[PDB]
Every structure is written in C-alpha cells, then in structure tokens.
Amino acid sequence: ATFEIVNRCSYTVWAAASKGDAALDAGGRQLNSGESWTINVEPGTNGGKIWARTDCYFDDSGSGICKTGDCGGLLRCKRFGRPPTTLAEFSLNQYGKDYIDISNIKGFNVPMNFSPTTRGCRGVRCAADIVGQCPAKLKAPGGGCNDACTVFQTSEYCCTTGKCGPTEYSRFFKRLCPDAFSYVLDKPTTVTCPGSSNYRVTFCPTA
Ligand SMILES: [Cl-]
C-alpha cells in the first residue's frame, strides 16, 4: 500500500521510511516546502517508520549528514535514524488488521500527522510545539527534544526490565501530544485499521 509523505513546513526536510534491515521503496528523498512524495511499502512490512530529517547536506553519490534523523549518511535511509525523531511507526496487514501510531519514544523533531487515505479509520497527529516548550535537559543542541532514554540512558527511561512507568520527561511529551507514545509502554495510542489501506504522513500539519 501507498504512503504519501507530505512536507508542510516552512523549511526543506528529508523524509525517510525504513525498517530494521531495509529501506522502503527508495529509502528517503529531499522535500522542499509543499513537495509531496509517493512510495509503496511492500505489504506485510512489520516495523515500518517514516520520519523527517532537518538540516541535511549531501553530495552526488548519496552520502552526507543530518542534524536530525541521521541514518548513516544514506539519503535512502536503510536503518532507523539517530534518536532525535518524531516517528510514524506502522506495521501493515498483520492478520487483516493495519497498525499505525506516532511516537515520542525516540524524542521529537517535527510536528507530524499520520492520517490514513481511505475510509478505514481516523488518523493521529502530534502537532504541538514541543521543541519550543522543551524542558532544559532535553532540548538537544542540533534542534529538537531528545527523549529521556537517549539523553540519560537509564532502565527507567529506556525500559529494559519490562517494568517501567511514566516520568516527568514522559509526562512532557504526553502533556503536549496526548496521541503519541511518550514512554515505551504507554497505554497504547496505536490506531488499528483495514489492511491494504493507504496513508498521508503530513509533516508540519495545521497552517
Ligand atoms: Cl546518540
């Protein structure tokens, strides 16, 4: 199924859609303000994230760097990004039931929306100004709020034991985005949908 990845910001991002060990369709392409981009995630992709990388520079070959969502310099993102990232997590068909969700488990970088394109379900969003209303010890240097996990690296933040709960750093991403995973275990905000359904991943929605 398809995934329109719309840039709606004022600044050029570099979208990216990948899984564990493989890119999706192409991998990730530059996006001037308003540029739309269509791809086709192979049906049955478990572990599919789409995100945006800001302040990236490249060369001909396809090898550079990104202040956010960097993934080994590979414009065509094969891996997941370097943490500080708002993710459109998804797993597709999964027993005739599709699964999508925004997440601030790996921080936040870009107000995102993950609406479905069909008549299958409602979508989600994460529009609020996190990066601005950031708590001091998260506002990353580059730009964007890292997550407590990546910043501090405690079991309580990154959830190793299995038994973890909300925090003040997780209750910041919740206060602002009530419809995205703050901590790794949060009362799932996932939305289930029909299998073989398409999606719009509008970065910077509402303007
Ligand atoms: Cl890091």
Side-chain angles (χ1 to χ4, degrees):
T2 91
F3 272 78
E4 195 168 38
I5 301 164
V6 177
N7 181 1
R8 187 167 303 154
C9 301
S10 41
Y11 48 72
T12 292
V13 306
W14 284 254
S18 92
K19 60 196 286 283
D21 211 340
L24 300 169
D25 192 39
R29 155 160 89 77
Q30 175 157 328
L31 278 185
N32 290 20
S33 323
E35 284 184 339
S36 312
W37 180 41
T38 294
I39 61 166
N40 270 303
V41 176
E42 210 145 60
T45 53
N46 218 307
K49 309 188 186 175
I50 287 156
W51 66 100
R53 311 164 286 184
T54 65
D55 284 317
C56 301
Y57 297 81
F58 292 112
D59 39 30
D60 184 1
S61 36
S63 280
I65 184 163
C66 284
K67 286 196 128 54
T68 38
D70 184 54
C71 77
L74 315 186
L75 164 69
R76 298 176 218 277
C77 264
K78 301 165 68 169
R79 296 181 186 260
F80 293 123
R82 158 134 156 62
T85 307
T86 324
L87 298 149
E89 291 189 24
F90 61 82
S91 304
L92 301 190
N93 290 96
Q94 284 280 101
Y95 280 98
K97 243 61 204 62
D98 225 286
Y99 287 90
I100 61 196
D101 45 324
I102 310 153
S103 42
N104 310 122
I105 302 160
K106 304 297 212 300
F108 173 91
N109 79 328
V110 159
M112 183 173 312
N113 188 314
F114 197 168
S115 82
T117 259
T118 352
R119 185 158 69 213
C121 46
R122 202 63 177 183
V124 279
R125 213 173 56 271
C126 197
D129 171 20
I130 278 68
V131 55
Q133 304 291 345
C134 208
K137 295 146 78 180
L138 286 177
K139 49 148 204 168
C145 302
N146 253 347
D147 184 34
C149 173
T150 284
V151 174
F152 286 101
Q153 301 226 34
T154 76
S155 303
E156 181 63 21
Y157 291 135
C158 298
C159 301
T160 270
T161 319
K163 226 137 183 78
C164 58
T167 78
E168 283 258 87
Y169 292 142
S170 140
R171 279 189 233 97
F172 157 79
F173 297 99
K174 209 80 216 152
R175 209 218 301 155
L176 287 263
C177 268
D179 208 343
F181 284 93
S182 38
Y183 63 99
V184 162
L185 254 199
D186 191 57
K187 190 215 75 183
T189 60
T190 305
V191 184
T192 295
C193 295
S196 307
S197 79
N198 344 131
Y199 312 86
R200 215 186 307 282
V201 178
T202 271
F203 302 132
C204 287
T206 323

